[PDB]
Design an enzyme around this catalytic site. Structure first.
Site: not given
Ligand SMILES: NS(=O)(=O)c1c(F)c(F)c(SCCO)c(F)c1NC1CCCCCCC1
Ligand SMILES: [Zn+2]
Length: 257
Positions: A61, A91, A93, A103, A116, A195
């Site tokens: 992911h 990690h 996004h 996000e 994050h 999230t």
């Protein structure tokens, strides 16, 4: 089954995870005009001098850089927090294009990515127990925009080729996450959630106002990762972000101005 595509992406998560439609979901849009300055909020305290990174993992992911959190080595405290929160992993996004990937959004503005750094409240003894508590986690979110390179990110970027596909991992020691912070520690904060599924409502979100810059070459290397596992059809790991969710009955507080 959950993921980020048309068939299993954020708009589907509620079917396996009804809390998706809950009262304190994340991320949110940060309306910088309606965020309330709060002079009682303390400076955020970031103590990463002793951080011990262990491994970097592609889970299918995103990728996670993991830390040894078996003692009080890398901790977040003060800010809006009571107690001590231990860093467990970081990690990111990010997007298929530089105009999206974050996000959280700031007056609807998307950033190219969002980092994050995930920490758990040491009064709950471990991360698994902390996620079951309304104040179990503090996640520090940092926006990335594209421009100059971030030198302290390059070690991360260079190792990505070695964890291209789901389930691959690599040794990743002596990474210093202070290399990922911006100069200022001014922040917004609100009560929110993970999230990604299980979408647990256990997070105090601390989102820095100042983005860091990363180079197009750096973010491009993120976009070369894969969601699929080795020897499956290539699905590029892009757009692994959950969109802004309803703020509902919540106040976003600012540490500044
Ligand atoms: N996005 S986030 O910061 O709210 C978040 C947490 F705070 C968590 F505590 C967790 S639990 C897994 C810890 O390794 C989480 F999955 C995510 N989300 C996942 C993002 C996408 C990729 C899966 C890898 C784990 C992080
Ligand atoms: Zn995240």
């Amino acid at each position: 089954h959950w993921g980020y595509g048309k068939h299993n992406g954020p708009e589907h998560w509620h079917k396996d995870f009804p809390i998706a439609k809950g009262e304190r979901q994340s991320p949110v849009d940060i309306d910088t005009h309606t965020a309330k300055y709060d002079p009682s909020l303390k400076p955020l305290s970031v103590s990463y001098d002793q951080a011990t990174s262990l491994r970097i993992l592609n889970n299918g992911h995103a990728f996670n850089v993991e830390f040894d959190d078996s003692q009080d080595k890398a901790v977040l405290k003060g800010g809006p927090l009571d107690g001590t929160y231990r860093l467990i992993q970081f990690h990111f996004h990010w997007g298929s294009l530089d105009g999206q990937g974050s996000e959280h959004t700031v007056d609807k503005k998307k950033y190219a990515a969002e980092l994050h750094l995930v920490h758990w409240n040491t009064k709950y003894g471990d991360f698994g127990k902390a996620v079951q508590q309304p104040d179990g986690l503090a996640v520090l979110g940092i926006f990335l925009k594209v421009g100059s390179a971030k030198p302290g990110l390059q070690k991360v970027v260079d190792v990505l080729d070695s964890i291209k596909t789901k389930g691959k991992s690599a040794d990743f020691t002596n990474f210093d996450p202070r290399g990922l912070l911006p100069e200022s520690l001014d922040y917004w904060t609100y009560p929110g959630s993970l999230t990604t599924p299980p979408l647990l409502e256990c997070v105090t979100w601390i989102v820095l106002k100042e983005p860091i810059s990363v180079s197009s070459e750096q973010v491009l290397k993120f976009r070369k990762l894969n969601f699929n596992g080795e020897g499956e059809p290539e699905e590029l790991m892009v757009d692994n972000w959950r969109p802004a969710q309803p703020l509902k009955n919540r106040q976003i507080k600012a540490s500044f101005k």
